[PDB]
Design a protein around this ligand. Structure first.
Ligand code: BAU
Ligand code: BAU
Lengths: 293, 293
């Protein structure tokens, strides 16, 4: 029905291709054999979260592997980790726009080389909330920039280029339905601001550098809230800009680890934080199992 | 004798500080005892390279423990890895400005809490060459942007802020003298262009997306070269800006994996690429040995 597509005429003309940061090559690896059956891709910053994710899905799907292991498909490199259980692939992306951008360029080409179709991609992550209790799960409506607009900007051969951000509306509704059925945590739908710096780029007072006042950053966070922003993270704008352009249905599901209107460091005890950290995995693995049921 | 400094008044008012992405805190770790002897810090993208680096410099210094693991000081998290031997720290930083930015805010705080002084910090890494033979090591003179200027722009509370990039001129000279004495590979001094992204951000033709022609990327690379740029990477601009601000003497030493005027993928056999990858490590460990003897 809907094949993954690239927006690059040069790919067709290449004899072989190397997915440098995955250590996978079309000369050595049989892409349709390895990945042709992939229907769900889940991505997140931490390699150990992504392995925890695949194990969670394994057990949900009863495709479980009880007493046994999920090999890292990227063994041989440590730029990203990658795991697979049935039609589900789990991929780490590190932190920040450039780190996920590289992963996405290589992932989208793998999916294309695998002859994948009807792929859903969901980012699971963590975030700072604005005016939400800690632990709230946010399903992103729009991924927005530091002016609270639905855009991703980058420089390409010296020229400022802008792409619109786009997340599948129907997917947001499907995820919300799952969350209501689960009833295990508060879930809200709102806008997610994506920044390039975690400290000064998100109005923190605890960096090595801070050129502004508590009152300054508070006015900034309030202005974000008024424009519909509910959480803050570092990957969502390029993720939304790229995935739509390539024929993938995409969502972003992040848990808030603190309320930024009240401060900058996490004051949840360790057991409570571990619980928050598995909420996006819980929702998404539940959602996948539903789809495969 | 120059202590590490912070540009943030709020730090003195905090009772404790958690370096979230290192899994270290000031209440649970005696930073002066643990890190107080640090005089050199080497940073790079890959944790496995940074572990290889510490093993290398440990042997140079006569501190090597045949049959002992170097422990990861950041055990408990997988955001970054960190290793130590005597007065040398090795820290991974992942890929891109945001990822290294997080690491540098926390590292500079750590060095401050440890009461370190006269610290030298050197980034080792890989790069795309412009008009250099593959495997050439570039000691960066100025870290430049896509206009080819020695500036780093960031958004702070929705506002553009421009900072100067400053790499220590004396340290460049010392690394150049070291390279001439070692005489194990071609070493040049030149400018290094720092881009946000890797595929379209560096004019490659092999991404999932590509908006320009081979001719247009070639012209842009030629304009970079005419402006003094000899290599291209993804972290030098923010590294230079932050380190100079906080009183660390900083330098960047990268190896070129290809010449981008010839194309975008590595023609080098993998055994050769493996020798190239070890060259910045070789130079900097040698430099540290000289400095400490
Ligand atoms: O405020 C945040 N902002 C943010 O971009 N994230 C993004 O996930 C980034 C890696 O920690 C996560 C948080 C929550 C947080 C708060 C304090 C310490 C660590 C993480
Ligand atoms: O062209 C480059 N540009 C670039 O920013 N780097 C930076 O180190 C980046 C992580 O892959 C490394 C290179 C060398 C290279 C070339 C082809 C494939 C992989 C790496």
């Amino acid at each position: 029905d809907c094949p993954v597509r690239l927006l690059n005429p040069n790919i067709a003309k290449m004899k072989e291709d190397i997915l440098y940061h995955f250590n996978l090559t079309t000369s050595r690896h049989n892409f349709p054999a390895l990945f042709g059956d992939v229907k769900f891709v889940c991505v997140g910053g931490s390699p150990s979260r992504m392995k925890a994710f695949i194990r969670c899905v394994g057990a949900e799907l009863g495709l479980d592997c009880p007493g046994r292991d999920y090999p890292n498909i990227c063994a041989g490199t440590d730029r990203y980790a990658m795991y697979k259980v049935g039609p589900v692939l789990s991929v780490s992306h590190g932190m920040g726009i450039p780190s996920i951008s590289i992963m996405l360029h290589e992932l989208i080409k793998l999916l294309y080389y695998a002859r994948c179709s009807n792929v859903t991609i969901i980012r699971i992550g963590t975030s700072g909330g604005i005016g939400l209790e800690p632990g709230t799960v946010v399903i992103t409506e729009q991924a927005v920039d530091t002016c609270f607009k639905a855009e991703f900007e980058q420089i390409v051969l010296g020229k400022r280029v802008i792409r619109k951000t786009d997340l599948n509306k129907k997917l947001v509704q499907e995820l919300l339905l799952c969350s209501a059925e689960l009833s295990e945590f508060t879930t809200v739908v709102g806008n997610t601001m994506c920044t390039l710096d975690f400290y000064e780029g998100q109005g923190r007072l605890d960096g090595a550098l801070c050129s502004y006042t508590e009152k300054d950053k508070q006015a900034y966070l309030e202005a974000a809230y008024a424009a519909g922003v509910r959480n803050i993270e570092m990957e969502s704008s390029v993720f939304a800009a790229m995935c739509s352009a390539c024929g993938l249905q995409a969502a972003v599901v992040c848990v808030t680890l603190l309320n930024r209107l009240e401060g900058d460091q996490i004051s949840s005890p360790r057991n409570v934080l571990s619980e928050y950290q598995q909420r996006p995995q819980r929702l998404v693995s539940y959602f996948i199992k539903k789809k495969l049921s």
